[PDB]
Paper text:
Sobemoviruses encode serine-like 3C proteases (Pro) that participate in the processing and maturation of other virus-encoded proteins. The overall fold change of Δ117Pro is typical for CLP and is very similar to the structure of SeMV Pro.
We crystallized and solved 3D crystal structures for two catalytically active forms of Δ117Pro: one in its VPg-free form, the second in its VPg-bound state with fused VPg at the C-terminal part (Δ117Pro-E/A-VPg), and one catalytically defective Δ117Procm form with S159/A mutation. The VPg sequence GEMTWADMVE, corresponding to residues 256–265 in Δ117Pro-E/A-VPg, forms a short α-helix that binds to the surface of Δ117Pro. W260 is a key residue in this interaction; it is located in a very tight and largely hydrophobic pocket, forming a hydrogen bond with the main-chain carbonyl oxygen of D77. The interaction of the VPg helix with Δ117Pro is also ensured by two additional hydrogen bonds: one between the K52 side chain nitrogen and V264 main chain oxygen, and the second between the I82 main chain nitrogen and M258 main chain oxygen. However, in the Δ117Pro chain B, Δ117Procm, and Δ117Pro-E/A-VPg cases, D92 is directed towards H49, as would be expected in an active Pro. Similar major structural changes have not been observed for the closely related SeMV Pro, the in cis active structure, which is very similar to VPg bound, a completely in trans-active RGMoV Pro.
Author numbering: 5 to 176, 183 to 195, 256 to 265
Write the structure that this text describes.
Amino acid sequence: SIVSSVAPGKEPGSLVCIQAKDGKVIGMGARVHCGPATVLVTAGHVLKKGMIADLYLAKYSVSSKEGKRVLMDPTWKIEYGSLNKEADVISVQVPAAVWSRLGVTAARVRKPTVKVPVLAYGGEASGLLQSSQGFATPDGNMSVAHSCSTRPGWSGTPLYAGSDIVAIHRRWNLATNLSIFHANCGEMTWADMVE
C-alpha cells in the first residue's frame, strides 16, 4: 500500500477528521448525499467514543489557512446505522452551518466492485493528512475487504474510488459496504461568528 503525504487542503472535499479535545485524531468520516440532503457518515465505534470524551469535527481551511473545528453536538439526529460489529456504521444529520464553517462538500456513495482501486485518508492533524492505496472487494453481505494501510485513528475513513465513496473503514482490513445502508436514503459569516 503506497502511503503518501497529502498537501494541506488536498484531501477530498467530503473528508473530516474526528478529534478529541486535545486534537488527537481518533477517527475519520465524510459528508455524503442522502436523498434531498446530506449526512455525516463514520464508524459507529468512533461516535461511541463520545461517551469517553468530547468529539470535534475537524477540517483544514485553505481560504483561512488554518484548522477549523466544531464540537459534535450530542443532540444531532441519526439517519441510519447499526452498532453490530459486522456493520459498525452511523450517519448523523449535521446542520448546514457546521458543514459551512468547516468547508465540507458532499460526496456520492457508489457500490464497490471486485478489486476496485481505492484511496483511504487519515493522519494526525487536519492539515497533515496521508493517503494509502489499495484494492477493495465486497463480501456479498455488508462488508468489504481492503488492502489500504491504516492506523488506529483511521476508523470511519471512506474508501474513495475516484470521486465517490464505496465503503467506510472499520478495523484490521475490513470496511462497511455503505451502498447497503444508503439504499434507505463582507468579512465574517454568522456561522464563523457564533463558533
